[PDB]
Amino acid sequence: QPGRFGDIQSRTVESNDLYANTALKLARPSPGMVHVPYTQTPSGFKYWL
Amino acid sequence: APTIIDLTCTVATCTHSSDFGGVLTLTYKTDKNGDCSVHSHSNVATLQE
Amino acid sequence: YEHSTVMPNVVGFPYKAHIERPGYSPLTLQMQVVETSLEPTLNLEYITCEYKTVVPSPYVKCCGASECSTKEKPDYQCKVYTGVYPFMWGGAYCFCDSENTQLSEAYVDRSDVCRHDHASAYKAHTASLKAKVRVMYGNVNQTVDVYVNGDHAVTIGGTQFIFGPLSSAWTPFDNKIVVYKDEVFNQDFPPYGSGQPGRFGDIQSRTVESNDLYANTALKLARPSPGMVHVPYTQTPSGFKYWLKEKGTALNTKAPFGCQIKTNPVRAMNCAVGNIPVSMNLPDSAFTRIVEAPTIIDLTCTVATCTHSSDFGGVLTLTYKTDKNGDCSVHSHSNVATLQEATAKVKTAGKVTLHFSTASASPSFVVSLCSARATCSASCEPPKDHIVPYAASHSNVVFPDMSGTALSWVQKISGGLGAFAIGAILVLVVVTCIGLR
Amino acid sequence: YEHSTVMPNVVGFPYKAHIERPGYSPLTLQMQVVETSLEPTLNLEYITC
Amino acid sequence: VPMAREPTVIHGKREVTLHLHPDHPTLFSYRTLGEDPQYHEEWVTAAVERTIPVPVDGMEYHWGNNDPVRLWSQLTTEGKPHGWPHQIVQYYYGLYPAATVSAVVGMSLLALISIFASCYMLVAARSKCLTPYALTPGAAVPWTLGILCCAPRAHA
Numbered sequence: 001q002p003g004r005f006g007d008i009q010s011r012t013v014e015s016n017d018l019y020a021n022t023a024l025k026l027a028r029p030s031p032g033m034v035h036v037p038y039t040q041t042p043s044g045f046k047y048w049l
Numbered sequence: 050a051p052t053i054i055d056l057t058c059t060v061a062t063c064t065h066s067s068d069f070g071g072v073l074t075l076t077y078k079t080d081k082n083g084d085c086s087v088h089s090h091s092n093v094a095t096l097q098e
Numbered sequence: 099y100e101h102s103t104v105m106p107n108v109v110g111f112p113y114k115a116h117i118e119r120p121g122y123s124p125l126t127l128q129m130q131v132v133e134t135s136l137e138p139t140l141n142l143e144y145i146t147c148e149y150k151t152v153v154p155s156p157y158v159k160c161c162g163a164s165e166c167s168t169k170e171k172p173d174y175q176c177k178v179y180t181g182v183y184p185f186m187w188g189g190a191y192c193f194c195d196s197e198n199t200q201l202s203e204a205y206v207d208r209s210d211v212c213r214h215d216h217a218s219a220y221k222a223h224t225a226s227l228k229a230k231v232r233v234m235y236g237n238v239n240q241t242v243d244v245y246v247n248g249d250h251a252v253t254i255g256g257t258q259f260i261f262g263p264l265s266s267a268w269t270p271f272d273n274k275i276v277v278y279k280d281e282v283f284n285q286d287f288p289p290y291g292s293g294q295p296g297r298f299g300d301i302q303s304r305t306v307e308s309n310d311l312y313a314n315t316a317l318k319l320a321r322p323s324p325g326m327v328h329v330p331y332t333q334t335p336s337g338f339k340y341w342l343k344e345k346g347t348a349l350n351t352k353a354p355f356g357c358q359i360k361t362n363p364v365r366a367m368n369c370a371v372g373n374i375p376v377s378m379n380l381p382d383s384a385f386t387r388i389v390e391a392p393t394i395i396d397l398t399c400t401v402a403t404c405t406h407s408s409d410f411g412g413v414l415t416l417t418y419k420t421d422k423n424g425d426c427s428v429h430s431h432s433n434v435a436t437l438q439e440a441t442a443k444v445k446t447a448g449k450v451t452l453h454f455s456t457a458s459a460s461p462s463f464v465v466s467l468c469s470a471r472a473t474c475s476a477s478c479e480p481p482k483d484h485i486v487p488y489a490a491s492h493s494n495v496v497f498p499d500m501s502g503t504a505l506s507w508v509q510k511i512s513g514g515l516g517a518f519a520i521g522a523i524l525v526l527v528v529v530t531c532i533g534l535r
Numbered sequence: 536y537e538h539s540t541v542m543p544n545v546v547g548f549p550y551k552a553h554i555e556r557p558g559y560s561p562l563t564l565q566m567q568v569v570e571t572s573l574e575p576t577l578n579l580e581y582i583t584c
Numbered sequence: 585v586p587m588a589r590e591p592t593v594i595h596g597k598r599e600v601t602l603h604l605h606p607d608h609p610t611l612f613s614y615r616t617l618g619e620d621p622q623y624h625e626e627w628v629t630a631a632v633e634r635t636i637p638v639p640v641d642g643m644e645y646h647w648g649n650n651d652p653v654r655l656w657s658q659l660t661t662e663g664k665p666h667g668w669p670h671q672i673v674q675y676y677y678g679l680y681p682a683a684t685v686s687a688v689v690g691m692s693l694l695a696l697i698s699i700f701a702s703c704y705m706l707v708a709a710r711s712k713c714l715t716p717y718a719l720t721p722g723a724a725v726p727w728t729l730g731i732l733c734c735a736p737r738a739h740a
């Protein structure tokens with residue numbers, strides 16, 4: 001679940017498969033601006049720390 | 050999804066073989082054409098479809 | 099045709115008013131309040147702003163007694179001190195040694211930003227509710243502004259609507275109100291002329307441009323430190339800043355019934371309270387003659403599924419026998435169920451599907467379609483989702499009708515138990531009458 | 536929406552799991568196990584040749 | 585002015601648990617939409633989880649500068665509402681507790697008073713018909729009444 005421990009998931013250190021639910025709800029750019037807004041739950045690993 | 054009313058079941062043939070040896074005909078009165086789920090609530094019978 | 103209903107004062111609820119003029123096809127008028135505003139009356143008792151403690155430059159006179167007259171300026175404090183010896187950068191101010199006198203002046207005025215930043219106090223009484231109602235019937239679909247009280251009449255497609263006074267005179271604003279830039283609070287502000295220093299109201303005035311000003315900010319100005327020119331003043335800091343920092347929880351986050359207060363024409367919006375009684379006078383030209391509308395015979399109603407969700411979670415189908423294809427009003431005569439659809443389409447095939455929202459385990463209602471009635475007794479199972487983001491679309495009535503599985507059991511138990519009880523009364527009467535003779 | 540069923544562990548059986556959220560048309564979700572591997576853990580005590 | 589990231593929401597029975605992750609301190613003000621506001625306003629400065637009640641009337645939570653979000657609570661409950669008095673009692677208990685318990689208590693009390701009153705009437709009838717036969721010297725107690733009512737077992 002996002003935010004808690006396990007936001008990112010990976011079987012091994014070098015494995016390619018990866019599972020993430022970090023709630024990347026990218027939003028509409030503000031007028032007159034190039035950018036890419038995204039609101040995201042911060043890394044659950046720092047929360048766990 | 051289609052809305053089904055006044056549903057009466059009659060079993061046409063019943064041969065309890067290993068394969069799907071029973072056929073039952075379902076009579077009803079729908080309101081629009083469409084697909085919908087069918088399932089037997091008891092494990093006495095299992096429906097192929 | 100004069101007709102009179104009451105609609106719930108909840109924003110978004112589609113209220114289906116059923117109008118049955120004999121000799122005409124019934125008409126369903128669907129009206130819903132898109133937004134409602136409750137503006138209280140204002141009085142503007144006074145205002146309070148950040149204050150400026152202006153002290154002029156002292157008059158340290160060279161050896162002559164000076165004494166200042168108290169002029170009527172707000173919280174004036176004027177005082178004379180003996181024996182000052184001011185010292186400025188180059189040296190002593192006045193050669194004469196001990197007789198120098200200091201005259202220190204201090205007064206308070208409204209800040210230079212008072213026009214922009216100021217919390218203004220009011221008293222509020224009555225409340226004029228002003229709403230926007232979207233009405234829809236036949237081919238007319240319009241939103242109109244109505245002062246909800248027995249006065250304002252609005253004509254929409256030839257029909258005249260009077261939206262009567264609210265059933266409940268509740269208002270979110272108490273007698274005494276204060277308003278800052280965006281938020282409102284209800285607190286017993288001190289009357290004019292009785293503001294204690296420090297607390298809210300230490301500096302008060304009638305209008306944002308009025309020149310009068312009343313302030314007790316405790317300017318107990320003190321004696322200058324020896325050998326340096328200045329005016330020491332002590333004063334409780336501005337009460338506005340204090341009130342800013344410990345406002346309390348504002349009414350925008352306290353308002354009962356979940357209405358939002360806006361500020362400039364200060365008002366409480368979308369307050370879900372009470373019933374709006376509506377009286378409608380409709381012309382003959384908005385109705386449909388019986389002769390030009392389908393005639394429905396032998397209408398029997400069975401419920402397909404029944405899930406008493408907030409959304410339109412029940413579906414029932416009507417079987418009938420018509421004579422011509424056409425659309426006509428459909429409406430549920432009891433508030434146990436509310437039908438999403440107002441005008442239903444009737445084909446020669448005797449089947450029309452409608453969606454209804456309910457809250458009862460056993461909703462029993464008589465559905466009316468194109469001038470014929472049928473009864474519909476259902477049996478709803480509860481929904482499994484817990485939190486949903488849309489308001490309830492059913493009037494919250496729960497009492498299951500008799501012949502519902504729940505109260506039918508109560509009926510059966512009571513009937514049997516009482517039957518054995520009245521049998522007991524019968525046998526007692528029999529034995530006592532046999533014994534009496 | 537959380538649902539919890541049990542399916543026999545026999546390869547090939549079409550199991551028809553019936554999911555009914557009230558307010559939606561029930562969905563029958565069919566699953567079957569195509570192959571199941573029971574891999575024991577090992578220790579390799581010794582080898583003989 | 586920034587917009588704080590939208591919290592993860594976990595739904596529960598008449599309560600909702602939010603999982604609030606500010607990057608800088610923010611307001612979190614929640615109020616119920618009913619007669620009694622049940623309000624609460626709080627600054628959040630570290631990642632927290634907060635359970636807020638969502639009565640059937642409705643709740644509104646205001647996090648940071650996002651627009652307030654209104655959540656309502658459906659009539660969810662445990663127990664089948666149409667089979668056997670046990671499941672209907674459970675259904676009502678979940679929906680409106682502390683009122684259906686009053687209802688069942690009252691119904692059961694009335695049932696008890698009915699049963700006891702009826703049984704007392706029955707035993708009173710037993711008396712009123714048998715006491716004329718216990719005060720006689722000759723305990724006849726004809727077997728009609730002897731069977732129909734439990735006979736005192738008169739002792740010749």
Ligand SMILES: *[C@@H]1O[C@H](CO)[C@@H](O[C@@H]2O[C@H](CO)[C@@H](O[C@@H]3O[C@H](CO)[C@@H](O)[C@H](O)[C@@H]3O)[C@H](O)[C@H]2NC(C)=O)[C@H](O)[C@H]1NC(C)=O
Nearest residue numbers: 159160161162163164180191192193194195196197198199
């Ligand atoms: C120039 O400097 C002289 C020297 O100080 C100033 O003379 C001062 O004149 C005032 C006038 O009243 C004297 O004050 C009086 O003193 C008596 C006795 O102490 C007191 O009883 C009175 O109430 C009053 O205060 C002051 O004594 C006198 N200075 C001296 C040293 O005697 C003069 O005023 C200055 N002129 C200008 C234009 O600055």
Ligand SMILES: *[C@@H]1O[C@H](CO)[C@@H](O[C@@H]2O[C@H](CO)[C@@H](O)[C@H](O)[C@H]2NC(C)=O)[C@H](O)[C@H]1NC(C)=O
Nearest residue numbers: 128132133232233234235237238239240241440
């Ligand atoms: C009556 O007219 C209004 C005028 O727009 C309709 O309201 C809008 O309908 C469109 C249709 O998709 C929606 O996208 C808008 O959100 C609606 N606006 C509002 C403020 O709700 C309304 O739908 C019409 N009535 C019917 C029955 O369609």
